[PDB]
C-alpha cells in the first residue's frame, strides 16, 4: 500500500498526499470493475474533483478530494456551503454530508448578490445534483466558491472557464511533474493560492512571530523575534529528492531584517517570493513555423540558454560493496592487475575514490578484486557529473548492519547541473503539451517591430483540436502584463473578463507606441502594407489611421512582426504573450538505451547488460509479426539467431565483422 | 537494439532518418574498428577497442571513417506499441548531434506517435542479404500505399496541407459599381477608374474579368511572380497569364503550385494535365494527386514531388503568418438568433409540460428534437457564414481545409456543445448553452466531465480489446499466403451493385465508396460488355473500371458482378491471384508467395482500436 | 530512390526475384573479392569525399547497376551450383 513519496515539487507532494483511490487490499475494490465507479457520481460535487483523476488504466480510480471538502469523522466528506436564508444568504458555511446535501437546494456562487441578499430572482441552484432555475428563496445553501468544487491541483490554472476537461485533467496532472528550476518564476496570471501553496507546502521558511534578523547564513538563520527571544533554523542548501533534484530554501531576508509572524523566511526550491515559482514565463508567439512546430513541437529561441533560465541539478546516488567470498573476500582496492595504472589516479584513496571531480562513462568508481581477479566499480555509461559525497561503512558497522557476505558497503553521490537541452519537453498550465523541437539562433528568429523578440513559437494547429481557450486568454493577459510590468489574479471563473482584457490592451498599446512615437518613429512602410492587407481581409477597418488600426490590432491581441532571417514583416497579426510554461518530468526514458555488445543471461544466452552495458532492447512479438508482413526472411533469421540467442553464431558474426 | 526519445526531422527526408551519432557509435563499434583499422586509426582492432572505449580517446577521423562505413547503410525504427506492418520501417541513418532522435515528420502518424514523450526503438539488419532485404521491401520510401486497404499511408500533414490551401486559394472582397464589364470596354475603363478610385476593389465581380485580370496581363508566369515580388500582386489574386497556349485566369498561388508540380516531376506537360488548378487545394485532392502521380511516374518521381510538396507547404505555412486568436472564433449572429429560437421553443415545451399535457417522456423527446434541430440549424448558419462572410477565417480556413478540425470542434468552440448525455447515457435537458469563447458554468462543466470520463474509460478499454482481437486474428489467419497459379475453379461471387433495402423495400445502386472497397482490382469471372466496353473475363478491375461500372449501374445495366473471390478459390490452402485479385501497396496484382492472411489480420484488427 | 527500379522491375519477373538476384550479386562481389563486377571500369559508383565508391562503400548499388546492364544473367535454376562455384573459385583470384 505505502510506497515512495512524490518528491517532484512541494505541490506534487501535497497533491499526492491528499489524494484517495478506490483500489487497495482488493476486497474494497480490485482492478477489473470500475466502469460504474469511474463515472463521476453526482455526489462528487463539492466532494471530488473529477479532473484530477489519473488518466489511463487507473482512470476513475484515483482523485484528489474537493479542495475545501474535508472528512468530518469517518471517511465522509463534508463541504463548505454558504447558508442562504430566504432572500438573505448567510456567510456561515456548513460542511454538508453528501446524503444531507440532497435535502436542500444549493445555489451557485456565480450568482451576483448585493451582500447577504441575491441579485437575481431567477437563479440556478443544486437541488439534488440538477440545475434548478428557481427563485432565490428556494436555496438553503449557496456555493461557497468554485474552489470548493475542485481539489487543490485543479484550481491552479487561471482560465479554466474556456478549456476542455479532457486536457484540463492533462494539465492538472502535468502540474505534478514540474521540476523546480534554478530560476523560479511566478505565472504572469495566477489563481491566488501560490501563497497558500507555499504556506501549506513547507518549501519556504516562515517567521513564527514578529521579530528581526540576527543572522542569515547560507545554511542557517538566527532570527530574533519581538518576543525578546531568538532561534536559529538551519537552511537546506542542496538536498536530494526521491528523484535526485535540489532542495533549498532561497534566502529571502537580509540580516537585521524585521519579519512579522508567519513571515516567509527562505522561499522553497520552487518558490519565487513566497509564491509558487517553477518553470518560467517566456514571451511566446503562436505561428506555424516550417516543421519544428509540427503537431505539438515547441520551437525555442537561443536566449533562454544564454540566460540561466531553464536548468536544474540532477543528483545520482551510486553504491557498491565488498564481500568475503568463500573463494576469497572481494577486497575493495585500487588494483587493476593486468594492464594499466593510469586510470587509477582518479581512484585516489585505496578502494574509495577522490571527491569533487567530473566523471566520464566507464570510469572506475569503487575498486575491488574477486578471485586474484579484478572486480571493481566503475562510472555507469551515460553521464556522471561531479563527485559530491561518499559513505564508507566497512566491517566497522557503528549502527549499520551490512548484509551477510557483504564485507563492507559504500555509497557515492555525484551531481550534474542539467541544463535544458534539445530533447527536453515542456507544457503549459492550460493543458497543451509538447517537446522542444529545436532552439534557433536568435539572430534570424522573428522579432517585434521593437527589437525584443519572443521566446517560443508554437504550432497553432494544436489548439483547435484541443478545446482550451483559457490558454489563449492567458496569452493575451501575459502579453499585456509584459508592457504593464505587473501581475494579475484571475479566479477560475469569477476572474478577468474580456472587457478588462481590451482595456489593458488599449493601455499597453498606448504605452508601447507612445514611447515608439517618442522615439521619433510612427508607422513603417511594412506596417502600412500589412495594415492595408488586413483591411483587404477586413481585419482592420479601411480608412482608420494606421496608428488607430494598429491599436485595434493590439486590442485584437495580434500585432505585426518582422522575420529576422529574411527580416520581413509577417502577414497576419499574431497574438503573443508572456506564458508561464513548465518543463515536465524528463524521466529516464529520455536517456539513450543503446547497447550493441555486452552481457547475456545465465540460464539463457539472450543478451542482457544493464549496469555494465546499456542492455539489449525488448524485441516483442507483434514486431516479428510486422517482419512477417514483409518478406524479412534472413534478416529475421539473423535477429532471432545472431542477435537473440546464438552465443556461438553471434560471436562468429562479431569476428566476421571484425 | 536501442530506444530513446525522438524529434522531428523536417529537414530529414523519409528516405533517411535523424540519428544522433553517439548511439551508432556503440552500435557499429564492430564496423568502426573494422574501418579505423582499415585506416591507421589504431594499431590493431583491440588497440582500437581501447582507443574507442573512452569518450576522451575520441578522434574526429573516427567520424569520417564511420561516415565512410555507413555511406551505403540503413537501420530499422519502430514505435513501442506495434500494431501494423509499418509499425517499423527502414531508414538510411544520418549521424547527428544532440540526444534526441530526428524523425521525418510525415510518418508522425504512420507511427501513431505524437510528441508527448513516447520514445521509439531501433535495430539493424546485419547480413548483406539481410540488409538488402530490409532496404528492398522494408524501406518507407518503398512502403507507400496501405496494403491493409489500398489507401496511401503517406497522407500529407496539417501544416503542409494548410500552406498549399492558403497558397492556392483565391480572394474576392467587394463589388458595388458597374460589374457588367463583360461586353463594354468603356465599362472596363470606367470600372478601372473606379478601381483607380475606391469604386472598384481588385476582387470585384468582373463579368468577363475582375479588375485584377483586366489591369494586369502576364505572358510568362515569372512575370506575375515578380509582380508579387515587387509586392504588386498578392498570391490569392484574380489575374490572367498567357499560359503555354492559354490565357489562364488564375490566382498566383494556383499557378505557383502548378509550377511546383512541374519541377517535382520532369514531365510538366502531365504535371498540369493531371492537376486541377481550378480549386483551392484540399487534403482530399492532395491524396488524389499523390495517387495519380504515383500511378504515372512511380516511386522516385512521386517521392520527389512529395518532398518538394512538404518543403513548399512548410514554406508557405510559415510565410502566411497565420495564427489563431480568440477573435478568430467568429460567433455568427445567425447563431444567436437560432439560440434564441431554440430557447423560446424550449420554454414553450416546458410551459406545455407545466400544466402536465406533455409526459416527462413527451416533453423530454420534444426538447431533444428541438435541440437536435437547432444544432444543425446553427451548423448550417455558421457554415454559410464561412463560405461568404469569412472565406479566410483561420479557424474556418483550417476546418474547411483538410488539415484539422471538424464542424463539431468549431461548434463546440464557436457555438456550443449543447446536447450531452447524463451518466446513464441520456442527455440532460438543459444543453450546454455556452461556448469556450464563453465561460462554461461550474455545474455545466461538472456535468460535461462525465462524458469525457466515459470517453477516456471506453477508449482505454478498447485499446486492450483491439489488441486481443488482433491477437486472435493473427492466431487464425496466419496460415494464408498466395502460392498458386490460376485456380481453375470456375466459381466466383457476383457482387451486388444495389443496396436493396435502404427503405424497407428500396433497391438502389449500392453506395459508391463501399462498391470501390469491395470490387477494386477484382477479376472478372466473365467478360461483360457493360457500357460498350468489353470488360473481358478475368480482366483486373482498375479504379477507372470502377468508375465506368458505377456509371453503368446508374444506367442499371447490371446489379452484381461476375468476379472471382477467395471464397471460391480452389487452392486448398492459399488463394489464386485471380482467386485473390489485385490489391497491393503497389498497383499490379499480388505476387505469388505473399503472406496475405497476416495482412488481413492486421488490416482488420487495427481498425478495432477506434471502434 | 533507386535508378531504373521500374526498368529492373520490367526485366525482373517478381519483386522478390529481383531482391534475391541483387543480394546474390552483392554477396558475390563480397566473397570473391569485390572484383566480381562487369561495368566497373568506365562508369562506376563513386564516393563524395573521394572516388572510394569505386571499390565497395555499398555493393547493392553495384548489383543494381549491373542489373541495369545486360551484363549479368540471373537464372532461378541456371547452372549446377557445384561447378558454378568451382569455376568462380578458379577464375577469381580476387578472393
Amino acid at each position: 500500500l505505502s510506497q515512495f513519496k512524490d518528491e517532484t515539487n512541494p505541490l506534487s507532494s501535497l497533491r499526492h498526499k491528499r489524494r484517495i483511490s478506490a483500489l487497495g487490499p482488493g476486497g474494497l475494490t480490485r482492478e477489473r470493475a470500475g466502469f460504474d465507479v469511474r463515472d463521476v457520481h453526482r455526489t462528487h460535487y463539492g466532494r471530488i474533483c473529477p479532473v484530477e483523476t489519473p488518466e489511463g488504466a487507473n482512470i476513475g480510480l484515483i482523485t484528489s478530494l474537493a479542495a475545501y471538502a474535508r472528512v468530518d469523522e469517518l471517511g465522509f466528506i463534508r463541504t463548505p456551503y454558504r447558508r442562504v436564508v430566504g432572500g438573505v444568504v448567510t456567510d456561515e458555511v456548513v460542511y454538508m454530508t453528501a446524503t444531507e446535501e440532497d435535502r436542500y437546494t444549493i445555489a451557485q456562487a456565480n450568482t451576483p448578490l448585493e451582500g447577504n441578499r441575491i441579485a437575481a430572482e431567477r437563479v440556478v441552484a443544486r437541488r439534488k445534483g440538477e440545475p434548478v432555475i428557481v427563485s432565490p428563496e428556494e436555496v438553503e445553501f449557496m456555493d461557497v466558491s468554485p474552489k470548493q468544487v475542485f481539489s487543490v491541483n485543479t484550481n491552479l490554472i487561471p482560465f479554466l472557464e474556456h478549456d476542455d476537461a479532457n486536457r484540463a485533467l492533462m494539465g492538472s496532472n502535468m502540474q505534478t511533474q514540474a521540476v523546480p528550476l534554478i530560476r523560479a518564476q511566478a505565472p504572469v496570471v495566477m489563481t491566488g493560492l501560490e501563497e497558500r501553496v507555499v504556506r501549506d507546502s513547507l518549501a519556504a521558511l516562515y517567521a513564527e512571530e514578529d521579530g528581526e534578523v540576527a543572522k542569515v547564513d547560507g545554511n542557517r538563520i538566527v532570527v530574533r523575534y519581538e518576543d525578546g527571544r531568538l532561534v536559529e533554523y538551519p537552511l537546506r542548501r542542496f538536498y536530494r529528492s526521491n528523484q535526485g533534484t535540489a532542495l533549498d530554501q532561497r534566502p529571502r531576508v537580509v540580516v537585521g531584517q524585521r519579519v512579522r509572524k508567519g513571515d516567509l523566511l527562505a522561499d522553497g526550491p520552487a518558490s519565487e517570493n513566497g509564491f509558487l515559482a517553477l518553470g518560467q514565463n517566456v514571451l511566446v508567439a503562436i505561428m506555424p513555423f516550417d516543421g519544428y512546430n509540427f503537431e505539438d513541437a515547441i520551437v525555442i529561441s537561443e536566449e533562454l540558454l544564454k540566460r540561466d533560465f531553464y536548468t536544474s541539478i540532477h543528483i545520482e546516488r551510486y553504491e557498491i560493496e565488498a564481500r568475503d567470498t568463500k573463494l576469497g573476500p572481494e577486497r575493495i582496492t585500487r588494483d587493476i592487475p593486468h594492464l594499466s595504472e593510469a586510470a587509477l589516479r582518479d581512484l585516489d584513496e585505496e578502494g574509495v575514490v577522490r571527491i569533487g571531480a567530473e566523471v566520464k562513462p566507464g570510469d572506475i568508481l569503487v575498486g575491488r578484486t574477486s578471485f586474484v581477479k579484478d572486480t571493481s566499480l566503475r562510472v555507469p555509461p551515460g553521464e556522471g557529473g561531479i563527485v559530491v559525497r561518499t559513505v564508507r561503512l566497512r566491517r566497522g558497522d557503528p549502527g549499520v548492519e551490512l548484509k551477510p557476505g557483504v564485507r563492507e558497503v559504500v555509497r557515492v553521490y555525484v551531481a550534474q547541473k542539467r541544463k535544458l537541452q534539445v530533447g527536453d519537453k515542456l507544457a503549459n498550465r492550460h493543458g497543451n503539451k509538447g517537446v522542444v523541437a529545436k532552439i534557433l539562433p536568435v539572430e534570424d528568429m522573428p522579432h517585434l517591430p521593437d527589437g525584443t523578440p519572443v521566446d517560443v513559437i508554437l504550432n497553432p494547429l494544436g489548439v483547435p483540436s484541443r478545446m482550451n481557450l483559457g490558454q489563449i486568454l492567458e496569452t493575451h493577459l501575459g502579453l499585456a502584463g509584459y508592457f504593464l510590468g505587473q501581475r494579475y489574479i484571475s479566479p477560475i471563473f469569477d476572474g478577468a473578463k474580456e472587457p478588462e482584457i481590451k482595456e489593458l490592451l488599449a493601455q499597453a498599446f498606448e504605452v508601447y507606441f507612445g514611447k515608439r512615437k517618442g522615439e521619433g518613429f510612427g508607422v513603417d512602410k511594412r506596417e502600412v502594407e500589412v495594415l492595408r492587407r488586413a483591411e483587404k481581409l477586413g481585419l482592420v477597418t479601411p480608412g482608420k489611421t494606421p496608428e488607430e488600426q494598429l491599436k485595434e490590432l493590439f486590442l485584437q491581441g495580434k500585432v505585426v512582426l518582422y522575420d529576422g532571417r529574411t527580416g520581413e514583416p509577417i502577414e497576419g497579426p499574431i497574438v503573443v504573450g508572456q506564458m508561464f510554461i513548465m518543463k515536465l518530468y524528463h524521466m529516464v526514458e529520455d536517456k539513450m538505451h543503446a547497447r550493441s555488445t555486452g552481457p547475456y543471461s545465465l540460464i539463457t544466452q539472450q543478451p542482457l547488460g544493464g549496469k555494465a552495458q546499456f542492455g539489449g532492447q525488448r524485441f516483442g512479438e507483434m514486431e516479428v509479426w510486422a517482419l512477417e508482413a514483409y518478406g524479412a526472411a534472413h534478416t529475421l533469421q539473423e535477429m532471432l539467431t545472431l542477435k537473440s540467442d546464438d552465443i556461438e553464431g553471434r560471436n562468429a558474426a562479431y569476428e566476421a565483422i571484425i | 537494439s536501442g530506444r530513446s526519445v525522438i524529434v522531428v526531422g523536417p529537414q530529414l527526408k523519409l528516405h533517411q532518418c535523424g540519428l544522433p551519432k553517439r548511439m551508432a557509435l556503440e552500435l557499429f563499434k564492430p564496423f568502426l574498428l573494422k574501418k579505423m583499422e582499415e585506416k591507421g586509426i589504431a594499431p590493431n582492432v583491440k588497440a582500437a577497442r581501447r582507443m574507442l572505449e573512452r569518450q576522451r580517446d575520441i578522434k574526429d577521423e573516427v567520424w569520417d571513417a564511420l561516415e565512410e562505413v555507413i555511406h551505403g547503410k540503413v537501420v530499422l525504427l519502430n514505435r513501442a506499441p506495434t500494431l501494423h506492418r509499418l509499425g517499423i520501417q527502414a531508414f538510411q541513418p544520418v549521424l547527428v548531434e544532440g540526444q534526441s532522435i530526428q524523425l521525418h515528420p510525415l510518418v508522425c502518424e504512420a507511427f501513431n506517435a505524437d510528441f508527448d514523450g513516447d520514445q521509439m526503438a531501433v535495430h539493424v539488419p546485419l547480413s548483406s542479404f539481410a540488409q538488402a532485404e530490409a532496404r528492398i521491401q522494408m524501406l518507407s520510401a518503398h512502403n507507400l500505399l496501405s496494403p491493409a486497404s489500398g489507401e496511401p499511408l503517406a497522407k500529407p500533414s496539417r501544416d503542409i496541407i494548410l500552406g498549399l490551401y492558403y497558397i492556392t486559394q483565391v480572394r474576392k472582397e467587394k463589388k458595388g459599381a458597374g460589374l457588367e464589364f463583360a461586353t463594354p470596354e468603356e465599362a472596363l475603363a470606367a470600372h478601372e477608374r473606379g478601381e483607380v478610385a475606391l469604386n472598384a476593389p481588385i476582387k470585384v465581380a468582373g463579368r468577363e474579368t475582375s479588375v485584377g485580370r483586366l489591369k494586369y496581363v502576364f505572358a510568362n508566369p515569372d512575370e506575375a511572380l515578380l509582380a508579387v515580388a515587387h509586392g504588386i500582386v498578392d498570391l490569392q489574386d484574380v489575374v490572367t497569364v498567357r499560359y503555354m497556349g492559354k490565357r489562364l485566369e488564375t490566382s498566383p498561388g494556383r499557378i505557383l503550385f502548378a509550377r511546383i508540380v512541374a519541377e517535382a516531376v520532369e514531365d510538366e506537360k502531365v504535371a498540369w494535365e493531371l492537376i486541377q488548378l481550378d480549386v483551392p487545394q484540399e487534403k482530399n485532392s492532395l491524396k488524389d494527386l499523390v495517387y495519380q502521380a504515383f500511378l504515372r511516374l512511380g516511386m522516385e518521381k512521386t517521392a520527389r514531388l512529395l518532398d518538394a510538396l512538404k518543403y513548399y507547404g512548410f514554406t508557405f505555412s510559415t510565410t502566411s503568418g497565420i495564427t489563431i486568436g480568440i477573435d478568430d472564433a467568429v460567433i455568427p449572429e445567425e447563431k444567436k438568433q437560432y439560440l434564441e429560437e431554440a430557447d423560446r421553443k424550449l420554454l414553450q415545451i416546458e410551459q406545455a409540460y407545466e400544466m402536465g399535457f406533455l409526459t416527462d417522456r413527451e416533453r423530454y423527446d420534444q426538447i431533444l428534437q428541438l435541440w437536435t434541430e437547432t444544432t444543425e440549424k446553427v451548423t448550417q448558419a455558421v457554415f454559410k457564414n464561412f463560405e461568404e462572410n469569412y472565406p479566410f477565417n483561420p479557424l474556418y480556413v483550417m476546418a474547411q481545409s483538410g488539415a484539422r478540425g471538424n464542424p463539431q470542434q468549431i461548434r463546440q468552440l464557436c457555438g456550443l456543445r449543447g446536447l450531452m448525455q447524463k451518466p446513464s447515457g441520456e442527455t440532460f435537458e438543459v444543453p450546454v448553452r455556452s461556448s469556450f469563447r464563453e465561460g462554461l458554468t461550474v455545474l455545466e462543466y461538472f456535468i460535461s466531465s462525465h462524458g469525457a470520463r466515459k470517453g477516456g474509460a471506453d477508449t482505454a478499454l478498447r485499446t486492450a480489446d483491439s489488441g486481443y482481437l488482433t491477437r486472435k486474428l493473427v492466431d487464425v489467419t496466419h496460415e494464408i499466403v498466395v502460392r498458386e497459379a490460376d485456380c481453375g475453379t470456375t466459381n466466383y461471387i457476383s457482387v451486388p451493385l444495389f443496396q436493396p433495402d435502404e427503405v424497407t423495400r428500396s433497391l438502389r445502386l449500392r453506395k459508391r465508396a463501399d462498391i470501390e472497397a469491395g470490387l477494386y482490382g477484382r477479376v472478372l469471372a466473365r467478360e461483360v460488355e457493360v457500357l460498350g466496353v468489353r470488360l473481358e473475363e478475368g480482366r483486373y478491375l482498375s479504379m477507372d473500371d470502377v468508375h465506368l461500372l458505377i456509371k453503368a449501374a446508374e444506367a442499371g445495366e447490371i446489379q452484381e458482378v461476375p468476379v472471382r473471390s477467395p471464397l471460391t478459390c480452389q487452392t486448398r490452402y492459399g488463394v489464386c491471384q485471380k482467386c485473390y485479385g489485385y490489391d497491393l501497396s503497389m498497383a499490379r496484382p499480388v505476387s505469388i508467395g505473399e503472406a496475405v492472411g497476416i495482412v488481413a489480420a492486421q488490416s482488420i484488427g487495427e481498425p478495432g482500436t477506434q471502434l | 530512390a533507386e535508378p531504373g527500379i521500374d526498368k529492373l522491375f520490367g526485366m525482373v519477373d517478381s519483386k522478390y526475384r529481383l531482391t534475391v538476384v541483387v543480394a546474390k550479386r552483392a554477396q558475390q562481389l563480397l566473397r570473391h573479392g569485390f572484383k566480381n563486377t562487369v561495368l566497373e571500369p568506365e562508369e562506376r559508383p563513386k564516393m563524395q569525399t573521394l572516388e572510394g565508391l569505386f571499390d565497395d562503400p555499398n555493393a547493392v548499388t553495384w548489383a543494381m547497376k549491373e542489373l541495369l546492364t545486360g551484363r549479368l544473367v540471373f537464372g532461378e535454376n541456371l547452372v549446377p551450383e557445384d561447378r558454378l562455384q568451382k569455376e568462380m573459385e578458379r577464375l577469381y583470384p580476387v578472393e
Binding site: 518478406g631 526472411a633 | - | 522478390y16 534475391v20 537464372g75 532461378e76 549446377p80 551450383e81 561447378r83 568451382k86
Partner: peptide
Amino acid sequence: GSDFVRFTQVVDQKTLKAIEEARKEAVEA
C-alpha cells in the same frame, strides 16, 4: 520463402562460358 524465387543464381556471360568449358571437360581420351 517462395521456392520459385528464393534461389535464382546470378551469372555473367563469362560464367556461362566457364560452365561451358566445365561441361566440355567431360570428354575422355
